[PDB]
Enzyme design. Structure first.
Site, PDB file in Angstrom:
ATOM      1  N   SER A 170       0.870  -1.188   0.000  1.00 46.49           N
ATOM      2  CA  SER A 170       0.000   0.000   0.000  1.00 46.49           C
ATOM      3  C   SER A 170       0.897   1.226   0.000  1.00 46.49           C
ATOM      4  O   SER A 170       2.040   1.167   0.451  1.00 46.49           O
ATOM      5  CB  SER A 170      -0.875   0.013   1.279  1.00 46.49           C
ATOM      6  OG  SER A 170      -1.622   1.220   1.426  1.00 46.49           O
ATOM      7  N   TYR A 230      -2.956  -1.041  10.224  1.00 47.92           N
ATOM      8  CA  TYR A 230      -2.734  -1.224   8.811  1.00 47.92           C
ATOM      9  C   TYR A 230      -1.359  -0.705   8.386  1.00 47.92           C
ATOM     10  O   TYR A 230      -0.638  -1.396   7.683  1.00 47.92           O
ATOM     11  CB  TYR A 230      -3.823  -0.526   7.986  1.00 47.92           C
ATOM     12  CG  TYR A 230      -3.754  -0.904   6.524  1.00 47.92           C
ATOM     13  CD1 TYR A 230      -4.432  -2.023   6.044  1.00 47.92           C
ATOM     14  CD2 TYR A 230      -3.002  -0.150   5.624  1.00 47.92           C
ATOM     15  CE1 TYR A 230      -4.377  -2.377   4.681  1.00 47.92           C
ATOM     16  CE2 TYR A 230      -2.942  -0.492   4.263  1.00 47.92           C
ATOM     17  CZ  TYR A 230      -3.629  -1.600   3.805  1.00 47.92           C
ATOM     18  OH  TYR A 230      -3.553  -1.933   2.472  1.00 47.92           O
TER      19      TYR A 230
END
Ligand SMILES: [Cl-]
Ligand SMILES: [Cl-]
Lengths: 259, 260, 259, 260
Positions: free
Chosen positions: C146, C159
């Site tokens: 990401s 995350y």
């Protein structure tokens, strides 16, 4: 024929007559693109490359130019537009280097490398983007960097600084011209089997030493870098801008830490 | 005072008469250091800075020099040694900037910024390291970078390149000279409340805009950068080399991603 | 047919039934590869995806598995070897996330995300490499990261930490297994038009807000990420290992600094 | 002493009885701080550390706790507040490591390292920030990372992941809590001369090998890391948040690239 969208795109490549520039010239020829090969010094080499491009299925011209001279870069882009109708991919690949202990490095020597490796790429990038913006073209810039935009390089502080600068230049231009669909990326090669290194690599002790710093265990083939350029110039990389894509066999992962 | 090892150390600061350069000069004055203030043209400010250092508790000289001129950089370091007997800490702080759409930026304008911001620091670092190497001094170089060695900067491609370049320069010199006990580091200031920034920061809307880019919610005081310089120059940072220490109130952490 | 070398390669994809995993499943089908689609929860979705892969010119199975359970990952790789004969490309794509102020984030919630997003990828990577090493295969691992391996993410500290961890995991494995020709890379997507985001993107005020953080000015299409995966799995990326390739429309370049 | 603003500040240090943790405890003792020493099982070392802090000029308690256990982390921060009245600086220093070929690394072994090195620091950071937020304290978190949040580490994929994770954790919390004046930073130690490392570093060939990875040419003294911790905890670092400050003698600068 891999990237069908590359067919008939106009690709300018500074230092396109030898090494990585030549490998990229050939590859974009294999994609049936229109390659403009810039060279500084040696027409016979550039002519030999122009031929390979043509044989590979592409169209090619050669254009003499010093990337440290603004008129030459402006000329090069203008020549590309004259000869082929437009510009689609600008590849700033020209580069020089020489070892000097940093505390002994002259200002003129520092300037030659900065002028060539960074400022030349700025001029290239500027002229291409200027053309892209004025003519509403979703063009593409590839700046040839190095593992040494990340790996420091004693004896080569001028080179390291030039690529660290190229990194922030590329990232800035990518951000600034993203809303216009113009993408700007760096490639970061490690140790590649090119003319510049041909000396070192003949000495089997030096070749093994260089190889011991590559985790994948071999010196890179120039076509491995040209494959990265092909990808980045293509519509496959449509959402990819402002990156450095390292093609280095793992070199930026710290070779001294191998198990 | 705080860093006793800085007492009587000779500290050269380019652009040391205004803004961050001045704040560092004063801070090193507070540490009883001997400061060499470089300035481009405004002697009054330099003289003003000179007395602040003395009044804070240090010694200080002022020396005119343009960092784009090799002889001026060479003369600066030579003057420091002549006057104070040695050199311990070299601070390359001079910097210039101006906004131009990048495709419109002239070669002359690009060069002025590269020459001043990057090449000037190379010249200063080189002259200092040369002296350290020749005289077995475990000296210290601090190069003034910016959040913009990491944060790209539309309209300032020359500035961004100059500091991206400065990062690899610093990292390279730190690696190269680490065996000689010579440390080389960058400081990365965010938005700072320097005289030059008074124009923008007087206007309430421009001040709020800038503050909205800063997670800590305030524009930095030049003394907060000077505190970083003092730490890095001191033997407290003896095992710290080749780093950029951002003093930016969180700006490099992507301010657009702050929660609602 | 772009990457001819992908034809008949075995590609395992965790979370391959929806979003990016599905887009990659389809793309590797278009390259005529043998796609193993892992799914956790919803067979009907996985079956719909298996069909797209087959229609695109590839072969496909579906395999139920929870990536937080070691036996399930071991099973998945073993099933791929049973059904298709071997393994060539391991894609760890499964991921979960939820907003919580960090000072209020529970340990169980932190663990769920770490277990899923990082440890699952470790297990995937381990099992594939173990197979590659034992059978002398110059295999390939793609870990789905990401922009948030680089961009911090308040309300999503679990995350962010999971992807920061994935980055160093990928880099370590790439270095460690480089001498065996096994390459390990991350892809870093920005804001992509997938199920997870479908809520946010319906709200025109939120969609514009997200768009204002993308320099290229549009939310990414999942096929734009699958194109990156195709490249990295292919022999075109032969000298490329240990990298994160961001496909983010410029998002990592600091959207707040746009002119 | 150096940082007068650290006087009487309450500093919690996980794994604070040995190595870097101990050196930080003592240094903060030298700053007249009130130190809370967490330890896993060796009470004697903890008690040893306790008196060093007191002898250096500070107050100190010791508290047993396993950072993989949520209740222990919660109890640690609660004890600190009960005993000393408040909390100012949280230092998550506990860490474990062991070499295993990565394709052979067990899930249990991976988890032990992730749970201790990363999750433990999340738990400590969370509990501290919670207290700061609830009591409007402009507190400080320091997470002990490693050069291995940047330098990959074959045979230690769990350790490398844990610190790569810790980097984004720290950066995220710094961004999230910067508006509340709460700063969160990593320190990145290189090779350090800690009790644990005595085994390897006694052997001349292993010592030379390690030193060859260090551009400055020596293994760091734990006090050099403690100096970084003191700086970061103090108001000298008031504009510094979300950073990793490597104290590694140049190790992250790629030692294989040193000139001949
Ligand atoms: Cl931002
Ligand atoms: Cl290295």
């Amino acid at each position: 024929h891999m990237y069908t969208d590359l067919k008939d795109k106009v690709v300018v490549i500074t230092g396109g007559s030898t090494g990585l520039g030549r490998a990229m010239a050939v590859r974009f020829g294999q994609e049936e693109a229109k390659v403009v090969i810039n060279y500084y010094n040696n027409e016979e080499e550039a002519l030999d490359a122009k031929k390979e491009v043509e044989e590979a299925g592409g169209q090619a011209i050669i254009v003499q130019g010093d990337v440290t001279k603004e008129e030459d870069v402006v000329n090069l882009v203008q020549t590309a537009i004259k000869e082929f109708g437009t510009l689609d991919v600008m590849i700033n690949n020209a580069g020089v280097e020489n070892p000097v202990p940093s505390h002994e490095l002259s200002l003129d020597n520092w300037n030659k490398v900065i002028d060539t490796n960074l400022t030349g790429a700025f001029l290239g990038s500027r002229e291409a983007i200027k053309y892209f913006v004025e003519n509403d073209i979703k063009g593409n810039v590839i700046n040839m960097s190095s593992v040494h935009e990340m790996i420091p390089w004693p004896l080569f502080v001028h080179y390291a600084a030039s690529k660290g600068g190229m990194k922030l230049m590329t990232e800035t231009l990518a951000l600034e011209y993203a809303p216009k669909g113009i993408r700007v990326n760096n490639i970061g090669p490690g140790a590649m089997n090119t003319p510049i290194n041909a000396e070192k690599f003949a000495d089997p002790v030096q070749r093994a030493d260089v190889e011991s710093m590559i985790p994948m265990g071999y010196i890179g083939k120039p076509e491995e870098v040209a494959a990265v350029a092909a990808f980045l110039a293509s519509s496959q990389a449509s959402y990819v801008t402002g990156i450095t894509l390292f093609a280095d066999g793992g070199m930026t992962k710290y070779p001294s830490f191998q198990a």
